[PDB]
Nucleic acid binder design. Structure first.
Ligand code: NA
Lengths: 115, 115
RNA sequence: UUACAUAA
């Protein structure tokens, strides 16, 4: 399988889904550790949306599109995470810096009560 | 949406899946924080399996069925996470104690590179 | 009447 790295953002097809799950083709952020990312057929990712541009919850991290290379201002949803097989991935969009990933890590810890 | 709690174990159908995403009806462990569990229509869960013969990865936590009231000795796969609509949850099996959840937390931190 | 894969 393709190698990916924590911090990578890829388009992925998350369909089909049930109820309030996030579906469709959308950007996703790789949040699995890099050992699994190297050896496993699967990655763990967080959904990104543009339906909001500002964080509503402490599990949200805003992405400034111009700074980070996105089409529009988006938000990473650390309450919407899932293990996906790498075949769902298509094109790599970008790789987020440490400033962003530190915010992602805090949001993930809150999301999963690891605080 | 129904109230669930971190530490709860429910059956859920994780299918349909692609590739090596954990599929089928199986127990899942709620790992989302309880504020999210109260206010959101989705729950973040980890898949559980009974294939205890596979090599134990650092993202795996073993469940002794006699102690914890399961049908057979099982393994919590913290590399297999899903955010699912609560309507997927069916029968409640049990609620895991703090000793078990401390091991889950450690494995989750390894899975998501939050060590 | 409830997987496979994945950690030098
Ligand atoms: Na693909």
């Amino acid at each position: 399988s393709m190698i990916v790295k924590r911090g990578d953002v890829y388009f992925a097809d998350l369909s089909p889904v049930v109820g309030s799950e996030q579906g469709g083709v959308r950007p996703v952020l790789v949040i699995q550790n890099d050992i699994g990312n190297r050896f496993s057929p699967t990655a763990i990712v967080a959904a990104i949306t543009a339906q909001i541009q500002k964080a509503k919850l402490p599990t949200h991290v805003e992405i400034d599109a111009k700074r980070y290379g996105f089409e529009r201002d988006s938000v990473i949803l650390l309450e919407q995470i899932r293990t996906i097989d790498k075949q769902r991935l298509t094109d790599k969009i970008t790789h987020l810096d440490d400033e962003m990933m530190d915010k992602v890590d805090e949001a993930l810890q809150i999301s999963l009560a690891l605080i």
